[PDB]
Design a protein around this nucleic acid. Structure first.
Ligand SMILES: Cc1cn([C@H]2C[C@H](O)[C@@H](COP(=O)(O)O)O2)c(=O)[nH]c1=O
Ligand SMILES: Cc1cn([C@H]2C[C@H](O)[C@@H](COP(=O)(O)O)O2)c(=O)[nH]c1=O
Lengths: 319, 319
DNA sequence: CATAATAACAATA
DNA sequence: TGATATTGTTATTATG
DNA sequence: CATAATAACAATA
DNA sequence: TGATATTGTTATTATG
C-alpha cells in the first residue's frame, strides 16, 4: 500500500541545510526524515504504533499548539512518502481530546475579543500610510500597501495574487477589483479555490492595480512569484515583520503591536463600515470579502477585532 | 448496573391517555414503554443491540429531525429507568453521520438568513402592540406582551421567569431588569442556569414588572407556574400560536408568518440597535442578553434574522 | 570580542 | 464528526 | 352529518 | 469531540 518511500521535500531541506554558515540545526526535520526511514519495510501495526509512540514522547515539553503543528508535519510527510492509504495515517494523529481542547482555547480567546474590541483611533492615518506605500519603489513597501488596501494575506499578495479590473455595468468599478489565488483552501465546492471573485478596495482601483503591476514586474516580484509557503516565509517574513513594525509603531492602537495581518482585520472592519449593503450581516459580509467557505460564518468571528472611532462616538450618543 | 426499572413519566402519560375522549393514539410512547419493558432482565449486549435495531427500523420513513428527537425520547427513558451507567446508552444513539448532516443543514439555512435578512418595516407597531398587551386582563395577552418587551422564551415567561428591578447606582434601572430562570440549560460553569442577570427591556421596567405580577397572580398564572415543558406545551401552545398569528398578521413582514419566537429575535435586534455599548460585537451582545453560555458566540448566529428600516435606510445612504 | 541567519518553537484562522 | 495552512516569536548556530 | 382534542410528526437554538 | 431542550405543524381519534 506500499511499505517503501521517501518524503522528498524534507530531504531536500536537510541537504540544503547541510552547508549553511549560520543557524539552528534542523533537528525536527531530521526526526521526521528518520521516522519515514524507519517506516520503510514495516508491515505490522504494532511496530508502527511503537514508532509513533517514541515520536510523541520526544515531543513532550512543547506547547500544545506546537505539538499539533508537528503532527501536521509528520502526517504530511507520511502522505508524501507512502500516499493516502498508508495505515500509519490512522496511527500518527493526536487524540480527540487534544483537538477538542485546542478549540476550547481558541474559542475562549475570541470571545474575549468580542467582549472587548480595540478602538482603532488612528485608522485613517494607517490607511493613508498604506496608500503612500503603493507609490514606493521598494516592492516590500508596495506589498504592505496592498495588504492594507486589499486585505489579502501576505502570502497571497506577495506570491500568487491575481488582480484585475472589476466591471461596473458598462464601466470599470472604482471601489472594487477581481481577485484570484485564495490561500488556505483546497478544491471543493463552496470553496474559493482557483475561483475569481470581486472584493472591495480602500482606495481607487486604478492605483491598486498599477501598484500591483509594478510589484509583479520588479526583480524581487519575479523571485517571489509562485514560492512555496516555506520559501516565502524564510525569504521574507522577519523583514516584513520589522518593516511593518517600524511603519506603524506610533499610530497603531496601544493595546497591541502592529502585525502584518492587522491590515487584513482592519480592512474588513473598514470595508464593512463603508460598503456593506443592508440585507447582509457583518458575519456574512466578512466571510464574503475574506474568501471564506460557503456557509462558513464561523471563521469570520476571528476578524472582529477593532471598533472605529466613529462607531464608538455615535453608539456613545445614546441619551 | 441494574437490569430492571421503569420510565415512570412515559407510563403516567400512557395511563392518562387511556381515557381521552379525542385524539391520536400514543403509539410512540407505547413503543418506548415496551422497549424499556423488554430491556428488563437483559444482560447481553447483542440482545440490547437487536432490540435497538428493531426500534430504529420502525422509525424509518420519518424526517431526520424527527428521528433525532425520538432518539432523545428513548435515551431520556433509558436514563430515567436504569440510570446513567446502563450500557444501552452506548448502543441507543444515532450514528456520527446523522448528527454531522443535521449540523450541515442547520448551518446552511442560517447562512441563507445571514445573506438575506428580512426588513422588519413595521417593527414599531409590533412593539407597541406588545406594550398594549401588557395592560390586558387576559394573562395570555400579558404573556405575549412580555415575550416582546423582554425577549424571554414563552416557556420562560409563562412558567418559571423571575423578574426583579435592576438597580442603577442609587436608583432603579428604567430600561433594564433582573431575570432568573433560563431554560435549555443544565448546571455547569459559564452557564446561566439558576443565575440571575440583567437584561434590557423595550419599555419602562415599572410597566413590565407590574404586568408580570398580574400574570403571576391570575388563576391561569398559578396554574402555569412550574409546569413541565410537556404540560406547558399541551396546555398552551396551539392557542398561543393562533393568538400570536391573529395579533400581528397585517403588520408582520410579508416574508414570513408571525410566530411567538419572532418576538425574541426582534427583541435582540431592537435591544442591540438601542443599547449595545460600542466595544462589544453584535454576537457577544446577543449572547449576553439571550443568556447563552460563556464563549458561546455561535448560538447567536440563529437570531440574526431582521434588519430595521432605519439601518436599511442609512446603509443605503452611500454616495 | 557579538550578531546575522536559520530553524525550532509557537499562535492563529 | 477528523486531525490543516498559514502568520508570529525566539533559541541556537557558524562565523574574522 | 364534521370538528375539538391530542399526540405524532417536525424544525429550531 | 457526543448525541439535548425547546418551539412550530399536522394527522388521527372519539364524539350526539
Ligand atoms: C482540528 C482541525 C482544526 N482545523 C482548524 C480550523 C479551525 O478554524 C481551527 C479550530 O481550532 O482549527 C482544521 O483545519 N482541521 C482540523 O482537523
Ligand atoms: C448533536 C447535538 C446537538 N445539540 C444541538 C445544539 C446545537 O446548536 C445544534 C446543532 O445541530 O444541536 C445538542 O445540544 N447536543 C448534541 O449532542
Amino acid at each position: 500500500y506500499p511499505k517503501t518511500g521517501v518524503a522528498t521535500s524534507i530531504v531536500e531541506k536537510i541537504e540544503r541545510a547541510e552547508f549553511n554558515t549560520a543557524g539552528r540545526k534542523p533537528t525536527v526535520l531530521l526526526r521526521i526524515a528518520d521516522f519515514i526511514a524507519a517506516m520503510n519495510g514495516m508491515d505490522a501495526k504494532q511496530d508502527m504504533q511503537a514508532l509513533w509512540d517514541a515520536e510523541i514522547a520526544i515531543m513532550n515539553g512543547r506547547a500544545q499548539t506546537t505539538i499539533i503543528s508537528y503532527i501536521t508535519k509528520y502526517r504530511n510527510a507520511i502522505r508524501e512518502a507512502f500516499g493516502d492509504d498508508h495505515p500509519m495515517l490512522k496511527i500518527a494523529t493526536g487524540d480527540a481530546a487534544m483537538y477538542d481542547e485546542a478549540a476550547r482555547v481558541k474559542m475562549e480567546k475570541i470571545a474575549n475579543k468580542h467582549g472587548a474590541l480595540i478602538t482603532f483611533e488612528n485608522y485613517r492615518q494607517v490607511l493613508k500610510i498604506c496608500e503612500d506605500c503603493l507609490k514606493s519603489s521598494d516592492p516590500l513597501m508596495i506589498g504592505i500597501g496592498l495588504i492594507g488596501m486589499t486585505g489579502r494575506r501576505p502570502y497571497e499578495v506577495f506570491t500568487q495574487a491575481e488582480f484585475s479590473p472589476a466591471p461596473y455595468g458598462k464601466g470599470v468599478s472604482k471601489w472594487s477589483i477581481l481577485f484570484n489565488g485564495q490561500a488556505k483552501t483546497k478544491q471543493g465546492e463552496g470553496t474559493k479555490f482557483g475561483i475569481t471573485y470581486e472584493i472591495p478596495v480602500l482606495t481607487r482601483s486604478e492605483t491598486v492595480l498599477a501598484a500591483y503591476k509594478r510589484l509583479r514586474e520588479s526583480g524581487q516580484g519575479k523571485l517571489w512569484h509562485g514560492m512555496s509557503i516555506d520559501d516565502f516565509s524564510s525569504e521574507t517574513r522577519l523583514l516584513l515583520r520589522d518593516t511593518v513594525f517600524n511603519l506603524f509603531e506610533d499610530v497603531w492602537p496601544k493595546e497591541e503591536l502592529p502585525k502584518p495581518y492587522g491590515l487584513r482585520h482592519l480592512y474588513a472592519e473598514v470595508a464593512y463600515h463603508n460598503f456593506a449593503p443592508p440585507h447582509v450581516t457583518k458575519n456574512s459580509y466578512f466571510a464574503a470579502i475574506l474568501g471564506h467557505n460557503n456557509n462558513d460564518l464561523e471563521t469570520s468571528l476571528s476578524y472582529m477585532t477593532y471598533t472605529l472611532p466613529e462607531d464608538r462616538d455615535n453608539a456613545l450618543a445614546r441619551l
